[PDB]
Design a protein around this nucleic acid. Structure first.
Ligand SMILES: [Mg+2]
Ligand SMILES: [Mg+2]
Ligand SMILES: [Mg+2]
Ligand SMILES: [Mg+2]
Ligand SMILES: [Mg+2]
Ligand SMILES: [Mg+2]
Ligand SMILES: [Mg+2]
Ligand SMILES: [Mg+2]
Ligand SMILES: [Mg+2]
Ligand SMILES: [Mg+2]
Ligand SMILES: [Mg+2]
Ligand SMILES: [Mg+2]
Ligand SMILES: [Mg+2]
Ligand SMILES: [Mg+2]
Lengths: 210, 144, 102, 203
RNA sequence: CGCGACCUCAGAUCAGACGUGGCGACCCGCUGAAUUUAAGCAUAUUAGUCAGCGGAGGAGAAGAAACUAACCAGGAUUCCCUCAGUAACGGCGAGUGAACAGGGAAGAGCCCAGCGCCGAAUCCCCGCCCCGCGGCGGGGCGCGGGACAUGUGGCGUACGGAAG
RNA sequence: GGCCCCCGGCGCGCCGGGCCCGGGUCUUCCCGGAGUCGGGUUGCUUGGGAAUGCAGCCCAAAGCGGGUGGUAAACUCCAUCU
């Protein structure tokens, strides 16, 4: 029964909830098991980066997040094609590929090829047979320069282009920001109906004289 | 009422014509496993000493199988197509008379898929196709 | 300035240079090839037409095109699919008309 | 290229040639037993499209199932309860008849593995399906990679766990907004996740 | 008026294999209530839950888009946090109720059929010899059987592929 | 910390055999899963609301096609997947 002022509450406890209760007493144990697996995996791929393949620079989809940029699943085939990397060799040298990702614009395309060229320059390649160095690398830059990399490879970072203060011109002062937004909304709203009314008026115009 | 696409396989070759056709077709049977081994060993012996590659004019042979024959008909490479009359799943060959007529290659229907199988050393063959033929049998093939 | 990029309007959106490229090969799906067209024409003259397709051709022969479309849409199910089917059935009627003319 | 023609031919089930063949075959299958081994696939193109290969270890079983809905099996139609559950007729089984035919083939041949099945004909009272089975212990199957997966213990009785193509269609699986019921692998997997109270150590 | 080929069937204590039954906490496929709440009660709720049937494994299921989106776009599955007790459903009453984006754990991709080309290139079984035994394989031989053109294998699969 | 016994996976030289050409450019060709999709109706299911999914029955495809684009429908453009 309600009692004086209060919030109308709707608990979702009508469905025998006590049979399905997930306690978290194994959370500290789960963290230990995950840490041990991470350390074992890092030891297994001894000089390769512990986090794994390099990931591409990727902008977040919706209008809430498109100002941010993050790491994607893998590099697109268009990026690899212009970076000059075979799509089947890339996964061998630690480059994640995403065959189903497209490149709508060129800026995101060129942003990711500089990422691939930077990674390819920083990559130390070991020969398959250490006694027979065919085309991988010199022994000098892999004797001591080889070191397992901790953290994401070339972590994706949001950058801001700082603008220096400038003198406001008269054109900027006379710009009507609210009026432009109100008119732009109206123009998009009435664009279809304005064309139809012009079309109907054109039909009456081409036969008005008879 | 049997539709003509299925009823057409009741019109088979007469016994006399089917005898001349199979007697000619006996001259172009695919080589067996044993005589392929003998031919391959001879090529190995000849390549060792001393002729070399020696293609030696891969002879004309009877092409068999509905998928093989269909492509030959579509490419107008078959000179004569022989279709068995008793293919039990009768969908493998119902298009072949119409396809052969469209592509201009002469086709006949013969009694027995088992007789076609003996041509190719197997139990059963839907169709066999005549590609190019030896010169001494060009007169015989033309009459057929 | 005179005009600025806007989040609203007919030309809304952040301005990027569009990367033009060949379409993906999956987008090619559904295109009719010369060989597949040849096969389907072979099967059509081997098989014939479905009984509802023959009935719709009788309606098109007497030029009851609206009734033909009502019948096809009732059979096939949708307006878009019926319009495509009616054009094809009209095409085969016109094809056999000019075949019988000569 | 004959398989292309047979495929287009079977897409014309209402033609005179296909109507004749389907009627005669449906009569012949009606004369046989409900479960019956076929010497060869009736539709070789459809069989190999579904995974069948003409080699030792692949067998074909023709199954006949009864058509229609699922009558509630209660005595005298009395489903004692609220009127929303009074339904006896016009009820429908959750799994398709093709899935039922696969289950019946697999149960009889418990030593084989159901691969797929396809439609070969139907009557007013019967539907006929041909089920592809694999003998997992034949050496042709067992010595071949790309076929060794069916030989694993986890792949036994796929048709009874809804893992074949026909049985999968009733589970509501898929990607996107139409298939939110089965996020997590199944309806039960989604329901357990959505109905479990996560009581963290630090709340 | 018999003898053969094939097809479709049958028998065998035929040679060699395989399935059955148990457990069932977790998992998969079905079937599936009513108590209860609604201060009555019939839709609703309980609940796709209990009970019932089948099937597995050390995990299972899912899974590499006939996806999300509408952005300057993301990019298989599964799990956690959040979205969110929200959009929505509901005698719009009682009640019920997700998803996308975002941040993480983990991260891995592939194969056929089909279209084609390659002298069926392919596979199983049985005898003989040698190397081995430890889960029965390797090599060679057999004018040794069988499967298979009603289609085996190699190339190749939507990220295109093949041939010059 | 020591000693003893057993078992398993890591590099080198050798062993028995397999193991067969990769990329770029141009040209010429080739490209797809049907009683299935989809539609009507019925029953169940879903938050899915002029119908989310599943199933029975009837109808029953196409190939510049098909599916999706959370309000039924016609026309039109676009996006996205196959
Ligand atoms: Mg009730
Ligand atoms: Mg025995
Ligand atoms: Mg059991
Ligand atoms: Mg009450
Ligand atoms: Mg009370
Ligand atoms: Mg239970
Ligand atoms: Mg699994
Ligand atoms: Mg799976
Ligand atoms: Mg794919
Ligand atoms: Mg809140
Ligand atoms: Mg509920
Ligand atoms: Mg991580
Ligand atoms: Mg092949
Ligand atoms: Mg709308």
């Amino acid at each position: 029964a309600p009692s004086r002022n209060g919030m109308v509450l709707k608990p979702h406890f009508h469905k025998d909830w006590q049979r399905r209760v997930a306690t978290w007493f194994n959370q500290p144990a789960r963290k230990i098991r995950r840490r041990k697996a991470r350390q074992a995996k890092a030891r297994r791929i001894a000089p390769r980066p512990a986090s794994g393949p390099i990931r591409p620079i990727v902008r977040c989809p919706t209008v809430r997040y498109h100002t941010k940029v993050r790491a994607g699943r893998g590099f697109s085939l268009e990026e690899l094609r212009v970076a000059g990397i075979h799509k089947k060799v890339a996964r061998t040298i630690g480059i994640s590929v995403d065959p189903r990702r497209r490149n709508k614009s060129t800026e995101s395309l060129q942003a990711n090829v500089q990422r691939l060229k930077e990674y390819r320059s920083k990559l130390i390649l070991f020969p398959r047979k250490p006694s027979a160095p065919k085309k991988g690398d010199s022994s000098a830059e892999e004797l001591k320069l080889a070191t397992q990399l901790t953290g994401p490879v070339m972590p994706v970072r949001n950058v801001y282009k700082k603008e220096k203060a400038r003198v406001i011109t008269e054109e900027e002062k006379n710009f009507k920001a609210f009026a432009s937004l109100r008119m732009a909304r109206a123009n998009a709203r009435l664009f279809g109906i304005r064309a139809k009314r012009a079309k109907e008026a054109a039909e009456q115009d081409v036969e008005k004289k008879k | 009422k049997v539709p003509p696409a299925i009823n057409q396989f009741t019109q088979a070759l007469d016994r006399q014509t089917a005898t001349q056709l199979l007697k000619l077709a006996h001259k172009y049977r695919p080589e067996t496993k044993q005589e392929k081994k003998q031919r391959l060993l001879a090529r190995a012996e000849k390549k060792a000493a001393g002729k070399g590659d020696v293609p030696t004019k891969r002879p004309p042979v009877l092409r068999a199988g509905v998928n093989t024959v269909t492509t030959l008909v579509e490419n107008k490479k078959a000179q004569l197509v022989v279709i068995a009359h008793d293919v039990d799943p009768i969908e493998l060959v119902v298009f072949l008379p119409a396809l052969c007529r469209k592509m201009g290659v002469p086709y006949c229907i013969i009694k027995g898929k088992a007789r076609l199988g003996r041509l190719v050393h197997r139990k059963t063959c839907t169709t066999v196709a005549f590609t190019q033929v030896n010169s001494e049998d060009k007169g015989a093939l033309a009459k057929l | 300035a005179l005009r600025y990029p806007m989040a609203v309007g007919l030309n809304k959106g952040h301005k990027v240079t569009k990367n033009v490229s060949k379409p993906r090969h999956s987008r090619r799906r559904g295109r009719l090839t010369k060989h597949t067209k040849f096969v389907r024409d072979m099967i059509r003259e081997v098989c014939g037409f479905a009984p509802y397709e023959r009935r719709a051709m009788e309606l098109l022969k007497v030029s009851k095109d609206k009734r033909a479309l009502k019948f096809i849409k009732k059979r096939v199910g949708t307006h878009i699919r019926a319009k495509r089917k009616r054009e094809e059935l009209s095409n085969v009627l016109a094809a056999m008309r000019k075949a019988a003319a000569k | 290229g004959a398989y292309k023609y047979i495929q287009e031919l079977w897409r014309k089930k209402q033609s005179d040639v296909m109507r004749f063949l389907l009627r005669v075959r449906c009569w012949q299958y009606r004369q046989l037993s409900a479960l019956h081994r076929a010497p060869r696939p009736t539709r070789p193109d459809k069989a190999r499209r579904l995974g069948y290969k003409a080699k030792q270890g692949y067998v074909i079983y023709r199954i006949r199932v009864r058509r229609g809905g699922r009558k509630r099996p209660v005595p005298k139609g009395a489903t004692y309860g609220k009127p929303v559950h009074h339904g006896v007729n016009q009820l429908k089984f959750a799994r398709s008849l093709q899935s039922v035919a696969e289950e019946r083939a697999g149960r009889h041949c418990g030593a084989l593995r159901v691969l797929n099945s396809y439609w070969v004909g139907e009557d007013s009272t019967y539907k006929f399906f041909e089920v592809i089975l694999i003998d997992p212990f034949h050496k042709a199957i067992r010595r071949n990679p790309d076929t060794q997966w069916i030989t694993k213990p986890v792949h036994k009785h796929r048709e009874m766990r809804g893992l074949t193509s026909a049985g999968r269609k009733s589970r509501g699986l898929g990607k996107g907004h139409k298939f939110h019921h089965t996020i997590g692998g199944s309806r039960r997997a989604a329901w357990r996740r959505r109905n479990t109270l996560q009581l963290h150590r630090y709340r």
